[PDB]
Ligand binder design. Structure first.
Ligand code: NAP
Ligand code: NAP
Lengths: 243, 243
C-alpha cells in the first residue's frame, strides 16, 4: 500500500533548514492540473484509496495549513480521522473569516475536542488585543501576526511563517492548498534550498477543464527522488524539489 | 512492463464508430499539464521507459498525426523505431510547411525509406493540382483537402478528417499533439460518442510552469476503464472517454 511507499517522505530529521518545520506540500489534481472544478460544478478528483493516504499523512504531521479561500470554498474540518491531534493553521491576512467563525466546521471541531483549536495567521494589527482575548476565550482561537517587514508585494514571507510555527514547537506542517499557496511554495527557496521537504500529489483520472482552479508555478520546477504509486483509480507521485 | 498494461487499449475491432479509424490520443505531460517548455527552454518530460512505450504504440497504428505547429516546433521524425511502417499525417490548413518541405526531418525520412511519405491536410484549393503532382513526384507527398462545408470558424471537422483517413484505408491513427489538437479531440463527440477510442498519457515528474504549452479542455471530461502504470520515473494512464 501507500505506507511503505511513503516511508522516505514522512517527516524525518534530515532537514536542510532546521529553523523550519518539516514541510510537506500535498494536493490532489486532475490530469489537467486543476484542484477544483469550475464554479457550480462538483469537484471529484481523489478517490477513497488516496483519501486514506492523506489521512495517514496527517497522522504524521504536527500541523495542517490551508488558505482562507480553501476554508471559504470547502468548510474543511482539518482534523485527522485516525484521531491523532493536528493543529489547523489558516493563512488569513485580513481575517476575512471573522464573520464566519461561529459557523466554521474547523471551529466546531476545536470546541468539541474532535480537533485542535485553530491558529489564524494575519497581518499586524488586524485583530485587536482584546478581540483576540475574546476569540481565544470564546473559541480557543490563536492569532499569529506577521510583521510588515516580512510582507513583500502583499505576500507574507513563507520563511517568516514557518519560523514562527517552528518556534511554537510545530515540527512538521502539511500544507494542503489552495492553488495560490501551492504555486508560491513550489518556487519558494531560501538560498537555493526549497522550503518544501516532501511533495506528494494525487493525480485523479479526470479533466476539470479551463475554468477549474489551476496549479502551475511561475517557472519550471525540477523534482528529485521521484517515486510513483497507483491504485485502482488514482496515482500518487512522491518527490523532493531539486536545488 | 507496459505491453500487457496496454493490451486492452491498442487498436481493436470493437469500435462504436466504424466509419472512422481507431483513434489513440496520446501525449506526454508535466505535472502541471504542459506538453512543452516555455519558449527557448528545453522540454524534458518523458523518460526513456515511456519513450519506448510511445514507439511500441506507434508499431500498432497505421498512421501518426500532428499539427503544423508541432512540426515547426519539433521537426519530428514521425516514424517508428521498431521498423514498422507508419504514415505521417500533418494538419496544415494553409500548407505553411510548403517553404520548409525540403528541410523537414519527416520529408527526409520519407525519401530515405526510413519513414513513409507524409500526407498533409489542407483547406480546399490551397495546393494547385499541378503543384500536388510536382510535390508527389519530388517528395512522395499526398495532399488531402477538407471541403469548405466541413470547416467552421477556421477549424476543420475532426469527423470529416477521420472519415477521409478511414476511407483511404488508415484503420488506426495515433494523434500525438499538439495542445490545440488534444484540447479539441478531448471534447469532440459524434452523437455523444467520443471520436477518441483510447487516451494514453505519460505524466512526467516535472513542472514546466505557466509559460509552457498547456493542455486543458474547454469543459470537464470524464474517463472510463481507467488503468495506471508506472516505471522508475514516469506514470502512464490509459482510459476511454465516457459517453
Ligand atoms: N484538490 C485539492 O487537493 C485541494 C486542496 C486544497 C484546496 N483546494 C481548492 O483550492 C481552491 C482555492 O485555491 P486559492 O488559490 O483560490 O486559495 P488558497 O490558496 O486557499 O488561499 C489563498 C489566499 O490565502 C492568502 N494567502 C496565501 N498565501 C499567502 C501569502 N504568502 N501571503 C499572504 N496571504 C497569503 C491570500 O488571502 P487574501 O485573499 O485575504 O490576501 C490568498 O488570496 C478551492 O477551490 C479549494 O477547494 C483543493
Ligand atoms: N509532450 C508531448 O506529448 C507533445 C506532443 C506533441 C506536441 N507537443 C508540443 O506542442 C506544441 C504544439 O501545440 P500547438 O497547439 O501550438 O500546435 P498543434 O496542435 O500541433 O497545431 C495547431 C495548429 O494546427 C492547426 N489545426 C489543429 N487542429 C485544427 C483543426 N481542427 N482545423 C484546422 N486547423 C487545425 C492550426 O494550424 P494554423 O495555425 O495553420 O490554422 C493550429 O493553429 C509544440 O511545442 C510541441 O512541442 C508536445
Amino acid at each position: 500500500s501507500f505506507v511503505p511507499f511513503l516511508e522516505p517522505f514522512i517527516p524525518h530529521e534530515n532537514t536542510l533548514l532546521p529553523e523550519l518545520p518539516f514541510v510537506t506540500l500535498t494536493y490532489a489534481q486532475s490530469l489537467d492540473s486543476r484542484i477544483a472544478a469550475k464554479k457550480g460544478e462538483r469537484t471529484v478528483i481523489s478517490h477513497q484509496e488516496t483519501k486514506n493516504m492523506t489521512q495517514y499523512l496527517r497522522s504524521k504531521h504536527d500541523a495542517i495549513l490551508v488558505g482562507v479561500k480553501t476554508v471559504l470554498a470547502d468548510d474543511p474540518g482539518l482534523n485527522c480521522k485516525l484521531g491523532t491531534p493536528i493543529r489547523p493553521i489558516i493563512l488569513d491576512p485580513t481575517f476575512q473569516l471573522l464573520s464566519k467563525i461561529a459557523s466554521l466546521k474547523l471551529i466546531k471541531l476545536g470546541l468539541s475536542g474532535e480537533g485542535e483549536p485553530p491558529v489564524f495567521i494575519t497581518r499586524k494589527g488586524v485583530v485587536s488585543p482584546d478581540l483576540q482575548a475574546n476569540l481565544r476565550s470564546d473559541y480557543g482561537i490563536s492569532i499569529v501576526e506577521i510583521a510588515d517587514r516580512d510582507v513583500h508585494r502583499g505576500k507574507m514571507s513563507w520563511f517568516a511563517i514557518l519560523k514562527i510555527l517552528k518556534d511554537a514547537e510545530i515540527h512538521s506542517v502539511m500544507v494542503e492548498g489552495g492553488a495560490t499557496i501551492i504555486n508560491d511554495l513550489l518556487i519558494c527557496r531560501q538560498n537555493s534550498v526549497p522550503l518544501v521537504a516532501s511533495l506528494i500529489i494525487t493525480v485523479g483520472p479526470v479533466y476539470l477543464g479551463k475554468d477549474g482552479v489551476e496549479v502551475t508555478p511561475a517557472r519550471s520546477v525540477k523534482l528529485g527522488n521521484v517515486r510513483w504509486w497507483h491504485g485502482i483509480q488514482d496515482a500518487v507521485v512522491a518527490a523532493s524539489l531539486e536545488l
